[PDB]
Protein backbone atom coordinates (compact mmCIF):
# COMPACT_ATOMS: atom_id res chain seq x y z
CA UNK A 192 0.00 0.00 0.00
CA UNK A 193 1.01 3.65 -0.56
CA UNK A 194 1.43 5.48 2.75
CA UNK A 195 0.03 8.62 4.30
CA UNK A 196 1.52 11.08 6.77
CA UNK A 197 -0.86 13.21 8.79
CA UNK A 198 0.54 16.04 10.87
CA UNK A 199 -1.61 18.25 13.10
CA UNK A 200 -0.12 21.56 14.14
CA UNK A 201 -1.85 22.65 17.33
CA UNK A 202 -1.53 24.82 20.41
CA UNK A 203 -2.48 28.22 21.78
CA UNK A 204 -3.35 30.84 19.16
CA UNK A 205 -0.86 33.56 18.32
CA UNK A 206 2.29 31.42 18.25
CA UNK A 207 2.74 31.34 14.47
CA UNK A 208 1.38 27.87 13.71
CA UNK A 209 -0.55 28.96 10.63
CA UNK A 210 2.44 30.65 9.04
CA UNK A 211 4.61 27.62 9.77
CA UNK A 212 2.17 25.16 8.27
CA UNK A 213 2.08 27.16 5.00
CA UNK A 214 5.85 27.54 4.78
CA UNK A 215 6.14 23.76 5.25
CA UNK A 216 3.64 22.99 2.50
CA UNK A 217 5.25 25.54 0.17
CA UNK A 218 8.43 23.38 0.13
CA UNK A 219 6.73 20.26 -1.20
CA UNK A 220 5.45 19.37 -4.64
CA UNK A 221 1.88 20.45 -5.34
CA UNK A 222 0.44 16.93 -5.40
CA UNK A 223 2.29 15.21 -2.54
CA UNK A 224 1.62 17.64 0.33
CA UNK A 225 -1.68 19.37 1.22
CA UNK A 226 -2.69 22.12 3.67
CA UNK A 227 -5.85 21.86 5.76
CA UNK A 228 -6.40 25.35 7.19
CA UNK A 229 -8.49 26.67 10.05
CA UNK A 230 -12.11 26.62 8.78
CA UNK A 231 -12.38 30.40 9.20
CA UNK A 232 -15.18 30.77 6.66
CA UNK A 233 -17.21 28.18 8.60
CA UNK A 234 -16.51 29.98 11.86
CA UNK A 235 -17.37 33.38 10.42
CA UNK A 236 -20.25 32.76 8.02
CA UNK A 237 -21.37 29.22 7.17
CA UNK A 238 -21.78 27.60 10.60
CA UNK A 239 -22.86 30.74 12.43
CA UNK A 240 -22.20 34.48 12.22
CA UNK A 241 -18.83 35.73 13.53
CA UNK A 242 -18.37 32.93 16.10
CA UNK A 243 -14.88 34.05 17.17
CA UNK A 244 -16.26 37.55 17.84
CA UNK A 245 -19.10 35.99 19.81
CA UNK A 246 -16.64 33.98 21.96
CA UNK A 247 -14.45 36.95 22.90
CA UNK A 248 -17.38 39.35 23.42
CA UNK A 249 -19.12 36.80 25.69
CA UNK A 250 -16.04 36.40 27.93
CA UNK A 251 -15.67 40.18 28.08
CA UNK A 252 -19.30 40.68 29.12
CA UNK A 253 -18.85 38.01 31.78
CA UNK A 254 -15.72 39.75 33.03
CA UNK A 255 -17.58 43.08 33.17
CA UNK A 256 -20.46 41.40 35.00
CA UNK A 257 -23.08 42.25 32.37
CA UNK A 258 -24.10 38.61 31.92
CA UNK A 259 -24.18 35.75 34.42
CA UNK A 260 -21.93 32.69 34.42
CA UNK A 261 -24.90 30.65 33.25
CA UNK A 262 -25.61 32.91 30.27
CA UNK A 263 -21.97 32.90 29.26
CA UNK A 264 -21.89 29.12 29.58
CA UNK A 265 -24.75 28.48 27.15
CA UNK A 266 -23.17 30.83 24.58
CA UNK A 267 -19.65 29.42 24.95
CA UNK A 268 -20.90 25.84 24.78
CA UNK A 269 -22.88 26.24 21.53
CA UNK A 270 -20.17 28.43 20.02
CA UNK A 271 -17.62 25.68 20.74
CA UNK A 272 -19.94 23.18 19.05
CA UNK A 273 -19.83 25.46 16.00
CA UNK A 274 -16.03 25.84 16.25
CA UNK A 275 -15.50 22.10 16.18
CA UNK A 276 -17.89 20.96 13.47
CA UNK A 277 -15.52 21.06 10.46
CA UNK A 278 -12.81 19.26 12.45
CA UNK A 279 -15.28 16.53 13.39
CA UNK A 280 -16.78 16.00 9.90
CA UNK A 281 -13.34 15.92 8.33
CA UNK A 282 -12.07 13.40 10.90
CA UNK A 283 -15.18 11.29 10.34
CA UNK A 284 -14.80 11.18 6.55
CA UNK A 285 -11.03 10.66 6.67
CA UNK A 286 -11.46 7.79 9.15
CA UNK A 287 -12.46 4.97 6.75
CA UNK A 288 -9.36 5.72 4.64
CA UNK A 289 -6.77 5.27 7.38
CA UNK A 290 -5.01 1.92 7.75
CA UNK A 291 -2.33 0.54 10.05
CA UNK A 292 0.82 2.38 11.10
CA UNK A 293 3.79 1.86 8.79
CA UNK A 294 10.45 5.63 2.68
CA UNK A 295 8.67 8.85 1.51
CA UNK A 296 4.86 8.95 1.99
CA UNK A 297 2.65 9.15 -1.10
CA UNK A 298 0.74 12.00 0.55
CA UNK A 299 1.35 14.35 3.45
CA UNK A 300 -1.56 16.20 5.08
CA UNK A 301 -0.64 19.17 7.26
CA UNK A 302 -3.58 20.16 9.46
CA UNK A 303 -4.03 23.49 11.19
CA UNK A 304 -5.22 22.15 14.58
CA UNK A 305 -6.56 18.72 15.63
CA UNK A 306 -10.21 18.04 16.68
CA UNK A 307 -9.08 18.11 20.34
CA UNK A 308 -8.50 21.86 20.14
CA UNK A 309 -12.23 22.57 19.78
CA UNK A 310 -13.44 19.44 21.62
CA UNK A 311 -11.07 19.68 24.64
CA UNK A 312 -8.54 22.50 24.88
CA UNK A 313 -10.60 25.65 24.37
CA UNK A 314 -13.51 24.20 26.37
CA UNK A 315 -11.13 23.36 29.20
CA UNK A 316 -9.62 26.84 29.02
CA UNK A 317 -13.04 28.50 28.99
CA UNK A 318 -13.91 26.42 32.02
CA UNK A 319 -10.87 27.91 33.78
CA UNK A 320 -12.10 31.30 32.54
CA UNK A 321 -15.40 30.61 34.29
CA UNK A 322 -17.40 30.68 31.05
CA UNK A 323 -18.10 26.93 30.83
CA UNK A 324 -19.11 24.18 33.27
CA UNK A 325 -16.75 21.25 33.75
CA UNK A 326 -19.67 18.94 32.98
CA UNK A 327 -20.00 20.42 29.52
CA UNK A 328 -16.26 20.18 28.99
CA UNK A 329 -16.60 16.46 29.80
CA UNK A 330 -19.49 16.13 27.32
CA UNK A 331 -17.18 17.47 24.61
CA UNK A 332 -14.48 15.01 25.85
CA UNK A 333 -16.83 12.04 25.60
CA UNK A 334 -17.58 13.05 21.98
CA UNK A 335 -13.91 13.12 20.99
CA UNK A 336 -13.63 10.73 18.00
CA UNK A 337 -11.56 7.55 18.26
CA UNK A 338 -7.89 8.38 17.78
CA UNK A 339 -6.90 7.22 14.32
CA UNK A 340 -3.53 5.50 13.77
CA UNK A 341 -0.64 7.83 12.92
CA UNK A 342 -1.98 10.85 14.78
CA UNK A 343 1.00 13.15 15.05
CA UNK A 344 0.30 16.32 16.96
CA UNK A 345 2.80 19.13 17.08
CA UNK A 346 2.37 21.48 20.03
CA UNK A 347 4.30 24.71 20.45
CA UNK A 348 6.72 26.15 22.98
CA UNK A 349 7.10 29.91 23.39
CA UNK A 350 8.07 32.05 26.36
CA UNK A 351 4.99 33.82 27.75
CA UNK A 352 6.90 37.08 27.37
CA UNK A 353 7.32 36.58 23.61
CA UNK A 354 3.79 35.18 23.28
CA UNK A 355 2.13 38.23 24.84
CA UNK A 356 4.14 40.57 22.61
CA UNK A 357 3.31 38.48 19.56
CA UNK A 358 -0.37 38.47 20.55
CA UNK A 359 -0.48 42.21 21.29
CA UNK A 360 0.67 42.99 17.73
CA UNK A 361 -1.95 40.72 16.17
CA UNK A 362 -5.39 41.92 15.08
CA UNK A 363 -7.76 39.09 14.13
CA UNK A 364 -11.44 40.02 13.52
CA UNK A 365 -13.56 39.34 16.58
CA UNK A 366 -10.61 38.79 18.90
CA UNK A 367 -10.04 40.90 21.99
CA UNK A 368 -6.65 40.85 23.72
CA UNK A 369 -7.14 38.75 26.83
CA UNK A 370 -4.05 37.61 28.70
CA UNK A 371 -6.13 35.72 31.25
CA UNK A 372 -7.41 33.49 28.43
CA UNK A 373 -3.88 33.35 26.96
CA UNK A 374 -2.59 32.04 30.29
CA UNK A 375 -5.44 29.50 30.41
CA UNK A 376 -4.94 28.10 26.90
CA UNK A 377 -1.15 27.87 27.42
CA UNK A 378 -1.65 26.02 30.71
CA UNK A 379 -4.22 23.72 29.07
CA UNK A 380 -1.91 22.73 26.17
CA UNK A 381 1.00 22.24 28.59
CA UNK A 382 -1.20 19.89 30.63
CA UNK A 383 -2.13 18.13 27.39
CA UNK A 384 1.50 17.45 26.45
CA UNK A 385 2.07 16.13 29.98
CA UNK A 386 -1.09 13.97 29.82
CA UNK A 387 0.10 12.08 26.75
CA UNK A 388 3.54 11.54 28.30
CA UNK A 389 2.00 10.47 31.62
CA UNK A 390 -0.26 7.99 29.79
CA UNK A 391 2.53 6.63 27.61
CA UNK A 392 4.65 6.03 30.72
CA UNK A 393 1.96 3.70 32.09
CA UNK A 394 0.21 6.26 34.27
CA UNK A 395 -3.28 5.36 35.41
CA UNK A 396 -5.43 8.21 36.67
CA UNK A 397 -7.73 6.06 38.82
CA UNK A 398 -4.70 4.75 40.72
CA UNK A 399 -3.30 8.30 41.01
CA UNK A 400 -6.51 10.27 41.71
CA UNK A 401 -5.80 10.51 45.44
CA UNK A 402 -2.60 12.46 44.80
CA UNK A 403 -4.56 15.48 43.58
CA UNK A 404 -4.74 18.63 45.75
CA UNK A 405 -4.22 21.94 43.92
CA UNK A 406 6.59 20.95 29.37
CA UNK A 407 7.22 18.35 26.65
CA UNK A 408 6.25 14.90 25.44
CA UNK A 409 7.83 11.80 23.94
CA UNK A 410 10.72 12.61 26.23
CA UNK A 411 11.39 12.84 29.96
CA UNK A 412 10.06 11.09 33.09
CA UNK A 413 6.43 10.33 34.01
CA UNK A 414 4.62 13.51 35.13
CA UNK A 415 2.68 13.89 38.33
CA UNK A 416 -1.10 13.64 37.76
CA UNK A 417 -1.39 17.18 39.15
CA UNK A 418 0.59 18.29 36.08
CA UNK A 419 -1.85 16.60 33.68
CA UNK A 420 -5.40 17.44 32.48
CA UNK A 421 -6.87 15.13 35.10
CA UNK A 422 -6.17 17.76 37.72
CA UNK A 423 -8.76 20.10 36.14
CA UNK A 424 -11.63 17.74 36.94
CA UNK A 425 -11.28 17.66 40.69
CA UNK A 426 -14.18 20.13 40.76
CA UNK A 427 -16.90 20.21 43.46
CA UNK A 428 -19.56 19.90 40.73
CA UNK A 429 -18.20 16.52 39.70
CA UNK A 430 -17.85 15.06 43.20
CA UNK A 431 -20.34 12.79 45.02
CA UNK A 432 -21.17 13.21 48.75
CA UNK A 433 -18.63 10.47 49.48
CA UNK A 434 -16.02 12.76 47.89
CA UNK A 435 -15.27 10.57 44.88
CA UNK A 436 -16.07 11.43 41.27
CA UNK A 437 -19.49 10.42 40.06
CA UNK A 438 -19.01 7.43 37.78
CA UNK A 439 -20.43 9.24 34.75
CA UNK A 440 -17.60 11.76 34.95
CA UNK A 441 -14.92 9.12 35.71
CA UNK A 442 -16.05 7.32 32.57
CA UNK A 443 -15.40 10.53 30.61
CA UNK A 444 -11.88 10.70 32.05
CA UNK A 445 -11.40 7.07 30.94
CA UNK A 446 -12.36 8.25 27.46
CA UNK A 447 -9.89 11.14 27.77
CA UNK A 448 -7.14 8.63 28.64
CA UNK A 449 -8.00 6.27 25.76
CA UNK A 450 -7.95 9.08 23.17
CA UNK A 451 -4.78 10.90 24.25
CA UNK A 452 -2.66 7.83 24.99
CA UNK A 453 -2.22 6.61 21.43
CA UNK A 454 -1.19 10.05 20.14
CA UNK A 455 2.32 10.89 18.93
CA UNK A 456 3.21 14.29 20.36
CA UNK A 457 6.12 16.51 19.32
CA UNK A 458 7.11 19.95 20.59
CA UNK A 459 8.12 22.78 18.27
CA UNK A 460 10.01 25.85 19.48
CA UNK A 461 8.30 28.94 18.05
CA UNK A 462 10.89 31.28 19.60
CA UNK A 463 12.54 31.95 16.23
CA UNK A 464 11.92 33.29 12.72
CA UNK A 465 9.21 31.85 10.42
CA UNK A 466 11.76 30.02 8.22
CA UNK A 467 13.39 28.74 11.43
CA UNK A 468 10.07 27.29 12.66
CA UNK A 469 9.52 25.76 9.23
CA UNK A 470 12.91 24.01 9.16
CA UNK A 471 12.63 23.04 12.83
CA UNK A 472 9.26 21.47 11.90
CA UNK A 473 10.65 19.73 8.81
CA UNK A 474 13.28 17.98 10.96
CA UNK A 475 10.56 16.84 13.35
CA UNK A 476 8.67 15.14 10.51
CA UNK A 477 11.55 12.65 10.28
CA UNK A 478 10.43 10.85 13.44
CA UNK A 479 6.74 10.79 12.59
CA UNK A 480 4.43 7.81 12.28
CA UNK A 481 2.96 7.20 8.84
CA UNK A 482 0.02 4.93 8.08
CA UNK A 483 -1.20 2.86 5.16
CA UNK A 484 -4.48 3.68 3.48
CA UNK A 485 -7.35 1.24 2.96
CA UNK A 486 -7.83 1.63 -0.80
CA UNK A 487 -5.32 2.46 -3.54
CA UNK A 488 -7.54 5.35 -4.63
CA UNK A 489 -7.72 6.68 -1.06
CA UNK A 490 -4.82 9.05 -1.76
CA UNK A 491 -6.60 11.09 -4.48
CA UNK A 492 -9.87 10.92 -2.52
CA UNK A 493 -8.09 12.25 0.58
CA UNK A 494 -6.39 14.84 -1.60
CA UNK A 495 -9.65 16.13 -3.10
CA UNK A 496 -11.25 16.33 0.37
CA UNK A 497 -8.36 18.37 1.78
CA UNK A 498 -8.36 20.73 -1.19
CA UNK A 499 -12.17 21.04 -1.18
CA UNK A 500 -12.10 21.90 2.56
CA UNK A 501 -9.25 24.38 2.06
CA UNK A 502 -11.07 26.01 -0.85
CA UNK A 503 -14.47 26.13 0.89
CA UNK A 504 -13.51 26.99 4.45
CA UNK A 505 -10.04 28.52 4.31
CA UNK A 506 -9.83 32.29 4.65
CA UNK B 507 -14.59 -18.06 20.99
CA UNK B 508 -15.76 -15.23 23.25
CA UNK B 509 -19.22 -15.02 24.92
CA UNK B 510 -22.04 -13.17 23.17
CA UNK B 511 -23.79 -9.86 23.83
CA UNK B 512 -27.24 -8.60 22.81
CA UNK B 513 -27.73 -4.82 22.82
CA UNK B 514 -31.27 -3.50 22.47
CA UNK B 515 -31.92 0.23 22.35
CA UNK B 516 -35.55 1.20 22.89
CA UNK B 517 -36.22 4.55 21.33
CA UNK B 518 -38.83 6.72 19.69
CA UNK B 519 -40.81 9.80 20.68
CA UNK B 520 -41.40 10.41 24.37
CA UNK B 521 -44.82 9.71 25.84
CA UNK B 522 -45.35 6.34 24.14
CA UNK B 523 -44.70 4.16 27.21
CA UNK B 524 -41.14 3.03 26.37
CA UNK B 525 -39.91 3.23 29.98
CA UNK B 526 -42.84 1.27 31.53
CA UNK B 527 -42.70 -1.49 28.90
CA UNK B 528 -39.01 -2.15 29.47
CA UNK B 529 -39.06 -2.16 33.28
CA UNK B 530 -41.53 -5.03 33.01
CA UNK B 531 -39.34 -6.87 30.50
CA UNK B 532 -36.45 -6.60 32.95
CA UNK B 533 -38.48 -8.73 35.37
CA UNK B 534 -38.95 -11.94 33.36
CA UNK B 535 -35.41 -13.05 32.43
CA UNK B 536 -32.92 -13.85 35.20
CA UNK B 537 -31.77 -10.74 37.09
CA UNK B 538 -28.21 -11.78 36.22
CA UNK B 539 -28.07 -12.15 32.42
CA UNK B 540 -30.10 -9.04 31.55
CA UNK B 541 -29.64 -5.39 32.57
CA UNK B 542 -31.97 -2.44 32.11
CA UNK B 543 -30.08 0.80 31.45
CA UNK B 544 -32.69 3.46 32.32
CA UNK B 545 -32.99 7.09 31.26
CA UNK B 546 -30.26 9.17 32.92
CA UNK B 547 -32.88 11.29 34.71
CA UNK B 548 -30.59 12.10 37.66
CA UNK B 549 -27.96 13.46 35.23
CA UNK B 550 -30.62 15.51 33.39
CA UNK B 551 -32.05 17.01 36.61
CA UNK B 552 -28.99 17.33 38.89
CA UNK B 553 -25.57 15.98 37.84
CA UNK B 554 -25.00 17.63 34.46
CA UNK B 555 -27.06 20.74 34.99
CA UNK B 556 -30.09 21.94 36.95
CA UNK B 557 -33.40 20.68 35.56
CA UNK B 558 -32.40 20.39 31.88
CA UNK B 559 -35.85 19.10 30.87
CA UNK B 560 -37.60 22.13 32.39
CA UNK B 561 -34.97 24.35 30.73
CA UNK B 562 -35.80 22.80 27.35
CA UNK B 563 -39.61 23.14 27.42
CA UNK B 564 -39.55 26.56 29.08
CA UNK B 565 -37.23 27.80 26.30
CA UNK B 566 -39.55 26.60 23.55
CA UNK B 567 -42.53 28.14 25.38
CA UNK B 568 -40.76 31.51 25.75
CA UNK B 569 -39.83 31.50 22.06
CA UNK B 570 -43.41 30.55 21.20
CA UNK B 571 -44.68 33.52 23.22
CA UNK B 572 -42.14 35.76 21.50
CA UNK B 573 -40.39 36.51 24.78
CA UNK B 574 -37.01 35.50 23.31
CA UNK B 575 -35.58 35.30 19.78
CA UNK B 576 -34.88 32.33 17.48
CA UNK B 577 -31.19 32.92 18.21
CA UNK B 578 -31.48 33.00 22.01
CA UNK B 579 -33.58 29.85 21.94
CA UNK B 580 -31.02 28.08 19.73
CA UNK B 581 -28.03 28.73 21.99
CA UNK B 582 -30.01 27.53 24.98
CA UNK B 583 -31.38 24.52 23.11
CA UNK B 584 -27.95 23.52 21.76
CA UNK B 585 -26.21 23.53 25.18
CA UNK B 586 -29.09 21.65 26.72
CA UNK B 587 -28.92 18.91 24.08
CA UNK B 588 -25.26 18.45 24.93
CA UNK B 589 -26.22 17.88 28.56
CA UNK B 590 -28.99 15.47 27.56
CA UNK B 591 -26.71 13.37 25.38
CA UNK B 592 -23.66 13.16 27.67
CA UNK B 593 -24.47 9.92 29.57
CA UNK B 594 -25.39 8.30 26.23
CA UNK B 595 -22.10 9.42 24.71
CA UNK B 596 -19.84 8.29 27.57
CA UNK B 597 -21.56 4.93 27.83
CA UNK B 598 -21.22 4.13 24.14
CA UNK B 599 -17.59 5.23 24.25
CA UNK B 600 -16.63 2.94 27.14
CA UNK B 601 -18.70 0.06 25.72
CA UNK B 602 -17.20 0.22 22.20
CA UNK B 603 -13.78 -1.44 22.91
CA UNK B 604 -15.74 -4.36 24.34
CA UNK B 605 -17.82 -5.00 21.22
CA UNK B 606 -16.61 -7.73 18.89
CA UNK B 607 -17.98 -8.78 15.52
CA UNK B 608 -21.34 -10.42 14.86
CA UNK B 609 -21.96 -13.92 16.21
CA UNK B 610 -26.78 -20.34 21.97
CA UNK B 611 -28.66 -17.51 23.78
CA UNK B 612 -26.74 -14.32 24.70
CA UNK B 613 -24.45 -14.44 27.74
CA UNK B 614 -25.61 -10.90 28.48
CA UNK B 615 -28.52 -8.78 27.24
CA UNK B 616 -28.43 -5.00 27.68
CA UNK B 617 -31.68 -3.11 27.23
CA UNK B 618 -31.10 0.61 26.97
CA UNK B 619 -33.65 3.36 27.33
CA UNK B 620 -32.74 5.19 24.09
CA UNK B 621 -29.69 5.25 21.83
CA UNK B 622 -27.17 8.09 21.38
CA UNK B 623 -28.92 9.27 18.15
CA UNK B 624 -31.92 10.37 20.24
CA UNK B 625 -29.91 13.25 21.71
CA UNK B 626 -27.46 13.55 18.82
CA UNK B 627 -29.89 13.45 15.88
CA UNK B 628 -33.60 13.14 16.58
CA UNK B 629 -34.27 15.74 19.26
CA UNK B 630 -31.95 18.34 17.65
CA UNK B 631 -33.73 17.71 14.32
CA UNK B 632 -37.18 18.07 15.92
CA UNK B 633 -36.16 21.28 17.65
CA UNK B 634 -34.93 22.54 14.29
CA UNK B 635 -38.44 21.85 12.96
CA UNK B 636 -39.63 23.76 16.04
CA UNK B 637 -37.60 26.82 15.09
CA UNK B 638 -35.36 26.52 18.17
CA UNK B 639 -32.19 25.01 16.70
CA UNK B 640 -30.14 25.95 13.63
CA UNK B 641 -29.63 23.23 11.01
CA UNK B 642 -25.83 23.71 11.33
CA UNK B 643 -25.97 22.80 15.02
CA UNK B 644 -27.89 19.66 14.05
CA UNK B 645 -25.24 18.57 11.56
CA UNK B 646 -22.57 19.33 14.18
CA UNK B 647 -24.24 16.75 16.46
CA UNK B 648 -24.57 14.42 13.48
CA UNK B 649 -20.83 14.78 12.82
CA UNK B 650 -20.16 13.56 16.38
CA UNK B 651 -22.37 10.44 16.26
CA UNK B 652 -20.11 7.52 17.29
CA UNK B 653 -19.40 4.98 14.55
CA UNK B 654 -22.08 2.31 14.40
CA UNK B 655 -20.86 -0.74 16.26
CA UNK B 656 -21.95 -4.25 15.21
CA UNK B 657 -25.25 -5.48 16.70
CA UNK B 658 -26.80 -2.04 17.07
CA UNK B 659 -30.50 -2.95 17.36
CA UNK B 660 -32.85 0.04 17.71
CA UNK B 661 -36.51 -0.54 18.66
CA UNK B 662 -38.79 2.26 17.47
CA UNK B 663 -42.42 2.67 18.50
CA UNK B 664 -45.66 2.70 16.55
CA UNK B 665 -48.71 4.40 18.07
CA UNK B 666 -51.58 6.31 16.40
CA UNK B 667 -51.40 10.05 17.12
CA UNK B 668 -54.52 10.35 19.31
CA UNK B 669 -53.58 7.38 21.47
CA UNK B 670 -50.05 8.86 21.77
CA UNK B 671 -51.44 12.22 22.91
CA UNK B 672 -53.36 10.39 25.67
CA UNK B 673 -50.21 8.66 26.95
CA UNK B 674 -48.08 11.82 26.70
CA UNK B 675 -50.67 13.47 28.98
CA UNK B 676 -49.88 10.96 31.74
CA UNK B 677 -46.16 10.40 30.99
CA UNK B 678 -44.85 13.96 31.49
CA UNK B 679 -41.29 14.18 32.85
CA UNK B 680 -40.49 16.79 35.56
CA UNK B 681 -40.41 20.28 34.05
CA UNK B 682 -42.03 19.03 30.85
CA UNK B 683 -44.81 20.90 29.04
CA UNK B 684 -47.52 19.36 26.93
CA UNK B 685 -46.67 20.47 23.41
CA UNK B 686 -48.62 18.93 20.53
CA UNK B 687 -46.41 20.73 18.02
CA UNK B 688 -43.22 19.23 19.52
CA UNK B 689 -45.11 15.93 19.66
CA UNK B 690 -45.79 16.08 15.93
CA UNK B 691 -42.25 17.31 15.21
CA UNK B 692 -40.69 14.44 17.16
CA UNK B 693 -43.05 11.82 15.66
CA UNK B 694 -42.13 13.04 12.16
CA UNK B 695 -38.39 12.88 12.83
CA UNK B 696 -38.63 9.31 14.12
CA UNK B 697 -40.85 8.53 11.14
CA UNK B 698 -38.28 10.01 8.75
CA UNK B 699 -35.57 8.11 10.70
CA UNK B 700 -37.18 4.73 10.05
CA UNK B 701 -37.63 5.69 6.39
CA UNK B 702 -34.00 6.80 6.18
CA UNK B 703 -32.63 3.45 7.39
CA UNK B 704 -34.76 1.62 4.77
CA UNK B 705 -33.75 4.10 2.03
CA UNK B 706 -30.06 3.56 2.79
CA UNK B 707 -30.32 -0.20 3.26
CA UNK B 708 -32.14 -0.58 -0.07
CA UNK B 709 -29.27 1.14 -1.86
CA UNK B 710 -30.37 4.77 -1.80
CA UNK B 711 -27.73 7.41 -2.43
CA UNK B 712 -28.58 10.90 -1.17
CA UNK B 713 -26.18 12.67 -3.55
CA UNK B 714 -27.74 10.88 -6.51
CA UNK B 715 -31.36 11.58 -5.42
CA UNK B 716 -30.73 15.08 -4.03
CA UNK B 717 -31.94 16.90 -7.15
CA UNK B 718 -35.37 15.33 -6.62
CA UNK B 719 -35.87 17.46 -3.50
CA UNK B 720 -35.98 20.49 -5.83
CA UNK B 721 -37.70 18.90 -8.83
CA UNK B 722 -37.60 0.16 -4.46
CA UNK B 723 -37.23 2.42 -1.46
CA UNK B 724 -38.78 5.55 0.02
CA UNK B 725 -38.52 8.85 -1.84
CA UNK B 726 -35.77 11.09 -0.48
CA UNK B 727 -38.45 13.64 0.39
CA UNK B 728 -39.62 11.04 2.90
CA UNK B 729 -36.21 10.61 4.56
CA UNK B 730 -34.23 12.69 7.04
CA UNK B 731 -32.29 14.13 4.10
CA UNK B 732 -35.22 16.38 3.15
CA UNK B 733 -34.67 18.28 6.40
CA UNK B 734 -31.26 19.52 5.27
CA UNK B 735 -32.51 21.27 2.13
CA UNK B 736 -32.43 24.27 4.49
CA UNK B 737 -31.35 27.63 3.03
CA UNK B 738 -28.79 28.11 5.81
CA UNK B 739 -26.85 25.16 4.39
CA UNK B 740 -26.83 26.33 0.79
CA UNK B 741 -24.51 28.45 -1.35
CA UNK B 742 -25.94 31.36 -3.44
CA UNK B 743 -26.39 28.93 -6.38
CA UNK B 744 -28.35 26.42 -4.35
CA UNK B 745 -25.56 23.90 -3.82
CA UNK B 746 -25.01 22.34 -0.41
CA UNK B 747 -21.71 23.45 1.06
CA UNK B 748 -19.33 20.50 1.09
CA UNK B 749 -18.89 20.58 4.86
CA UNK B 750 -22.64 19.93 5.28
CA UNK B 751 -22.69 17.43 2.44
CA UNK B 752 -19.92 15.51 4.27
CA UNK B 753 -22.00 15.61 7.47
CA UNK B 754 -24.73 13.98 5.37
CA UNK B 755 -22.23 11.31 4.25
CA UNK B 756 -21.56 10.57 7.92
CA UNK B 757 -25.29 10.40 8.71
CA UNK B 758 -25.73 7.87 5.89
CA UNK B 759 -22.79 5.74 7.09
CA UNK B 760 -24.14 5.69 10.68
CA UNK B 761 -27.79 4.82 9.95
CA UNK B 762 -27.25 2.30 7.16
CA UNK B 763 -25.83 -0.34 9.49
CA UNK B 764 -28.37 0.03 12.31
CA UNK B 765 -30.91 -2.74 12.65
CA UNK B 766 -34.36 -1.18 13.17
CA UNK B 767 -37.37 -2.94 14.72
CA UNK B 768 -40.88 -1.58 15.13
CA UNK B 769 -42.75 -2.13 18.39
CA UNK B 770 -46.48 -1.51 18.31
CA UNK B 771 -47.23 0.34 21.54
CA UNK B 772 -51.00 0.39 20.96
CA UNK B 773 -51.66 -2.45 23.38
CA UNK B 774 -51.43 -3.39 27.06
CA UNK B 775 -48.14 -2.84 28.97
CA UNK B 776 -47.85 -6.62 29.26
CA UNK B 777 -48.43 -7.05 25.53
CA UNK B 778 -45.80 -4.43 24.71
CA UNK B 779 -43.33 -6.45 26.76
CA UNK B 780 -44.28 -9.69 25.04
CA UNK B 781 -43.93 -8.08 21.62
CA UNK B 782 -40.51 -6.69 22.58
CA UNK B 783 -39.42 -10.20 23.61
CA UNK B 784 -40.31 -11.87 20.30
CA UNK B 785 -38.75 -8.93 18.47
CA UNK B 786 -35.41 -10.06 19.95
CA UNK B 787 -35.38 -13.22 17.84
CA UNK B 788 -34.38 -11.15 14.80
CA UNK B 789 -31.79 -9.01 16.56
CA UNK B 790 -28.06 -9.16 15.97
CA UNK B 791 -25.73 -10.44 18.68
CA UNK B 792 -22.03 -9.80 18.86
CA UNK B 793 -19.10 -11.43 20.56
CA UNK B 794 -17.22 -9.39 23.14
CA UNK B 795 -13.45 -8.71 22.88
CA UNK B 796 -12.09 -9.95 26.24
CA UNK B 797 -12.90 -12.75 28.70
CA UNK B 798 -13.82 -10.19 31.36
CA UNK B 799 -15.89 -8.00 29.04
CA UNK B 800 -19.19 -9.52 30.21
CA UNK B 801 -19.01 -8.73 33.94
CA UNK B 802 -17.30 -5.37 33.25
CA UNK B 803 -20.17 -4.44 30.88
CA UNK B 804 -22.58 -5.61 33.60
CA UNK B 805 -20.95 -3.35 36.20
CA UNK B 806 -21.11 -0.37 33.80
CA UNK B 807 -24.82 -0.92 33.15
CA UNK B 808 -25.72 -1.51 36.81
CA UNK B 809 -23.72 1.51 38.03
CA UNK B 810 -25.29 3.76 35.34
CA UNK B 811 -28.68 2.44 36.45
CA UNK B 812 -27.93 3.10 40.12
CA UNK B 813 -26.31 6.52 39.72
CA UNK B 814 -28.46 8.12 37.01
CA UNK B 815 -31.83 6.37 36.69
CA UNK B 816 -34.56 8.07 38.71
Ligand SMILES: C#Cc1cn([C@H]2C[C@H](O)[C@@H](CO)O2)c(=O)[nH]c1=O
Pocket residue numbers: 204229243246271274275304308309310313314366
Ligand atom coordinates in the same frame (compact mmCIF):
# COMPACT_ATOMS: atom_id res chain seq x y z
C1 LIG C 1 -10.08 25.09 16.93
C2 LIG C 1 -10.37 26.05 17.59
C3 LIG C 1 -10.74 27.16 18.40
C4 LIG C 1 -10.23 28.40 18.24
N1 LIG C 1 -10.60 29.48 19.04
C5 LIG C 1 -10.03 30.82 18.82
C6 LIG C 1 -8.53 30.94 19.01
C7 LIG C 1 -8.24 32.17 18.18
O1 LIG C 1 -8.70 33.31 18.87
C8 LIG C 1 -9.16 31.98 16.97
C9 LIG C 1 -8.54 31.25 15.77
O2 LIG C 1 -7.80 30.08 16.12
O3 LIG C 1 -10.28 31.21 17.45
C10 LIG C 1 -11.54 29.34 20.06
O4 LIG C 1 -11.90 30.25 20.80
N2 LIG C 1 -12.06 28.07 20.22
C11 LIG C 1 -11.74 26.95 19.47
O5 LIG C 1 -12.24 25.84 19.66
Ligand SMILES: C#Cc1cn([C@H]2C[C@H](O)[C@@H](CO)O2)c(=O)[nH]c1=O
Pocket residue numbers: 520559562587590591620624625626629630679682
Ligand atom coordinates in the same frame (compact mmCIF):
# COMPACT_ATOMS: atom_id res chain seq x y z
C1 LIG D 1 -32.35 11.27 24.93
C2 LIG D 1 -32.98 12.30 24.96
C3 LIG D 1 -33.71 13.53 24.98
C4 LIG D 1 -34.90 13.66 25.59
N1 LIG D 1 -35.62 14.83 25.63
C5 LIG D 1 -36.89 14.97 26.35
C6 LIG D 1 -38.11 14.22 25.82
C7 LIG D 1 -38.91 14.00 27.09
O1 LIG D 1 -39.66 15.18 27.36
C8 LIG D 1 -37.86 13.86 28.19
C9 LIG D 1 -37.47 12.42 28.54
O2 LIG D 1 -37.48 11.60 27.38
O3 LIG D 1 -36.67 14.52 27.70
C10 LIG D 1 -35.15 15.99 25.04
O4 LIG D 1 -35.76 17.06 25.04
N2 LIG D 1 -33.94 15.86 24.40
C11 LIG D 1 -33.16 14.73 24.32
O5 LIG D 1 -32.07 14.71 23.73
